[PDB]
Design a protein around this ligand. Structure first.
Ligand SMILES: [Mg+2]
Length: 811
């Protein structure tokens, strides 16, 4: 068998069969080639791996052309990666060139048998036929002893005999069946049957197995005189016999009982009959018996007692059976035929031991046994197969000519273990052994190997910034998988390579699925990324783990309740401050910076406030500080105001805020990934006043052409020229609430005296009234001072100015 012990190699590619084959179209399993003891390994390097195959890649023991047994172990990958079908096939045979067995049929041909007789005739004929049809004709010598009583069947002898002969032989068959053909008649001298059957068995010392099968209805009515006897386990056994005979004829009970030379009482034919059986057994014969429709022995002995006695004729009770009908008789003999045929199997109570390989686990604990040879192994003869404690064991294998069994189980390669190598052959079994019979040397199945291939996984960084400033040139990341505490993979993602790198890993996990990877970046000292909030996704289709760094930000837009546009001048006086807080109480600012309506400020997760500190010129100040939060996962939350802090509501799309006269402020979340929080802040205008000048000469005529200039406190100077009309001329510049202004005639018209008087106007907080002074002195509506008369009607301030002609020395 040296020529067919599977050999394995181990090297940088793993451990695998040196003489191998592959399954057509699969690259991750490798099996052991078949062979025979003469030629060695077969030439079959690839075939389909179909489990219904019974011809390819077997290891054949004995005659290469007619093996004693042949075996196969191979694996095939399933449609689930890492999960393999494994199959063990074993086919048997009938033995060749071994000694025959000798069987003597000992047939009760007494009258009490004849419809018993007819089932015996047919049963015996089928017994011989069965052995012939199984090709064991030449391995079974069968003889016959038929008994009745002296004078009937056998003549004086009381028995007939057909010598031991091959069961397969036509003339031997005829001789046996011809001998059993006369009508059964006479007494029942069971002792002579047992004696002569044993003598036939013992006539040589070839060393063949010796077997006697006794067919009787169980009541011996003739026996030899019992001379000595022994009591053994509370039954009486005759041990020495005279030539005189006890002849009760139609019952076992003696007419004239006696005490024998061992001082034991003999009152029936049983001591003699059991005695003779004991003598046969002691000589090395195996005695089987069929009790055919046992009936009460008149009113002497119950059928139950007879049955008890019958169970002592055989070597053990096991080897006595009852037959209740003609079919039971044929079935018994058929089963005796099968048992004898089974005797010549090359595999008898055979076993397989199959420990799973280190790098594999059982998919499940199911080991399915099926018959697949041309001759069926019935469900009751099929061996047992069980998986337990990392071992598949197959027991009670019984296989004759053209009988083959297949055992199927499943194993999964473990890729997750810390030491696992992809693209590396691991054996699916430990040493896997058929022991075909008790005491026989074990023989090896060929062990398959499996592997999981490596695959390339890509890691990519995606940046979504609010600027397009310089990003870092590199970024360090760490990959992990599901969380696996040993497995890690660091990578350097580089601007130069489109922010993409790769690693290799096993293509699938312990369950044959793609690994779920997670990735995280490390801090880079030279650049601040607290304003980026990362998210990730493995796209199995592209084999790419993308880490998305999303920048978040805040901005505001400023509006007016009235609906007018704001000047660039107006926006110059406006101030907004962004505050950041330490915690969700917003009780302590960590910082406060100016933010304009053209800014988009990147924000790290935190707590924040936005407040108008100064209104655009013309508009009222709303000093409300709105409070908000950017969470760690890029959620926006509204936390009310400084006056009334709330616990934080998620802002979903928009969140309407406090009323501003006519309108409401709002927070609105914008940008394509909700990355921008936009404040819309409204401003309501300050109520205002208009200033107009009426101009006259010293004689009540309106006087065009006098220049008057209005100087706002922090605003811009405006000059107008008087009309020659009662309506006068207005300034376009609105005198807004709280505002300070001065005015004077900056250019008298030609021929008129300049008037240097200084009008100061201070508008009330309401913006619906004003206080007026002139060269420091209070001037009230209706009153006059230094050429000016004041009137105030609603929100209109009117100054009537009188111009004096240049003085002339009169002549
Ligand atoms: Mg009888």
């Amino acid at each position: 068998t040296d020529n067919i012990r599977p050999t394995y190699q181990t090297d940088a590619n793993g451990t695998y069969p040196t003489n191998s084959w592959q399954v057509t179209g699969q690259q991750n399993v490798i099996n052991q080639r078949g062979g025979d003891q003469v030629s060695g390994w077969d030439n079959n390097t690839i075939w389909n791996g179909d489990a219904t195959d019974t011809t390819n890649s077997y290891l054949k023991f004995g005659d290469p052309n007619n093996p004693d047994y042949q075996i196969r172990k191979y694996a095939k990958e399933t449609n689930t990666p890492g999960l393999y079908d494994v199959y063990l096939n074993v086919k048997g045979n009938k033995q060749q060139n071994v000694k025959p067995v000798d069987i003597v049929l000992v047939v009760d041909m007494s009258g009490s048998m004849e419809n018993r007789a007819g089932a015996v005739r047919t049963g015996v004929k089928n017994f011989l036929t069965s052995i012939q049809n199984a090709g064991l004709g030449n391995y079974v010598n069968v003889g016959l002893i038929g008994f009745s009583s002296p004078g009937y069947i056998g003549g004086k002898s009381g028995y007939i005999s057909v010598k031991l002969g091959k069961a397969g032989n036509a003339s031997q068959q005829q001789a046996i069946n011809g001998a059993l053909s006369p009508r059964f008649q006479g007494g029942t001298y069971t002792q002579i049957g047992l004696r002569q059957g044993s003598a036939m068995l013992n006539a040589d010392t070839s060393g063949n197995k010796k077997m006697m099968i006794l067919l009787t209805d169980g009541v011996p009515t003739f026996s030899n005189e019992v001379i000595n006897s022994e009591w053994i386990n509370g039954t009486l056994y005759g041990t020495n016999f005279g030539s005189s005979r006890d002849e009760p004829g139609n019952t076992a009970r003696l007419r004239w009982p006696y005490t024998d030379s061992s001082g034991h009482y003999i009152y029936d034919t049983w001591p003699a009959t059991l005695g003779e059986a004991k003598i046969a057994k002691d000589s090395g014969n195996e005695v089987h018996a069929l009790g055919i429709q046992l009936a009460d022995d008149d009113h002497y002995m119950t059928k139950e007692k007879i049955r008890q006695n019958m169970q002592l004729i055989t070597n053990s009770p096991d080897l006595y059976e009852d037959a209740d009908s003609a079919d039971a008789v044929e079935a018994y003999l058929n089963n005796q035929a099968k048992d004898i045929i089974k005797n010549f199997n090359t595999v008898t109570d055979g076993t397989i031991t199959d420990p799973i390989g280190t790098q594999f686990q059982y998919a499940n604990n199911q080991a399915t046994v099926t018959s697949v040879g041309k001759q069926t192994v019935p469900a009751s003869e099929l061996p047992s197969a069980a998986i337990q404690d990392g071992q598949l064991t197959v027991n009670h294998m019984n296989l004759g000519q053209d009988q083959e069994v297949q055992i199927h189980y499943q194993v999964r390669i473990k890729t997750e273990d810390a030491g696992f190598k992809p693209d590396f052959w691991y054996q699916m079994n430990g040493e896997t052994l058929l022991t075909p019979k008790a005491g026989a040397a074990a023989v090896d199945f060929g062990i398959p190997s499996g592997r999981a291939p490596a695959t390339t996984v890509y890691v990519q960084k995606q940046w979504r910034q609010l600027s397009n400033q310089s990003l870092p040139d590199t970024l360090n990341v760490t990959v992990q998988r599901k969380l696996d505490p040993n497995w890690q993979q660091t990578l350097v993602l580089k601007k130069a390579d489109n922010w993409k790198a790769s690693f290799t890993a096993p293509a699938y996990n312990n369950q044959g699925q793609s690994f779920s990877y997670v990735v995280k970046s490390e801090d880079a000292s030279g650049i601040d990324l607290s304003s980026f909030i990362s998210s990730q996704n493995m796209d199995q289709q592209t084999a790419t783990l993308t880490l998305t760094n999303q920048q978040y930000g805040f901005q505001f837009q400023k509006k007016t309740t009235d609906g007018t546009d704001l000047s660039a001048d107006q926006l110059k006086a406006m101030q907004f401050n962004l505050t950041q807080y330490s915690d969700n109480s917003f009780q302590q600012a960590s910082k406060t910076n100016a933010i304009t309506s053209t800014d988009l400020q990147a924000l790290a997760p935190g707590y924040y406030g936005i407040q108008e500190a100064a209104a655009p010129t013309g508009y009222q100040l709303d000093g409300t500080t709105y409070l908000f939060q950017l969470t760690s996962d890029g959620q926006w939350q509204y936390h009310g105001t400084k006056d009334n802090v709330t616990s934080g509501s998620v802002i979903n799309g928009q969140q309407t805020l406090n009323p501003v006269g006519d309108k409401s402020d709002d927070f609105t979340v914008t940008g394509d990934h909700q990355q921008i929080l936009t404040l819309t802040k409204y401003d309501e205008p300050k109520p205002s006043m208009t200033l107009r000048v009426i101009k006259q000469d010293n004689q009540s005529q309106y006087l065009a052409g006098a220049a008057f200039t209005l100087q706002p406190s922090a605003g811009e100077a405006e000059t107008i020229t008087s009309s020659a009309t009662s309506e006068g001329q207005a300034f376009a510049t609105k005198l807004v609430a709280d505002g300070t202004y001065t005015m004077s005639e900056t250019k008298a018209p030609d021929g008129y005296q300049s008037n240097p008087a200084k009008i100061a106007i201070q508008v009330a907080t309401t913006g619906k009234e004003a206080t007026v002074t002139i060269d420091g002195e209070a001037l009230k509506p209706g009153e006059s001072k230094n050429g000016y008369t004041l009137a105030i009607d609603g929100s209109t301030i009117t100054l009537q100015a009188i111009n004096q002609p240049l003085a002339i020395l009169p002549l």
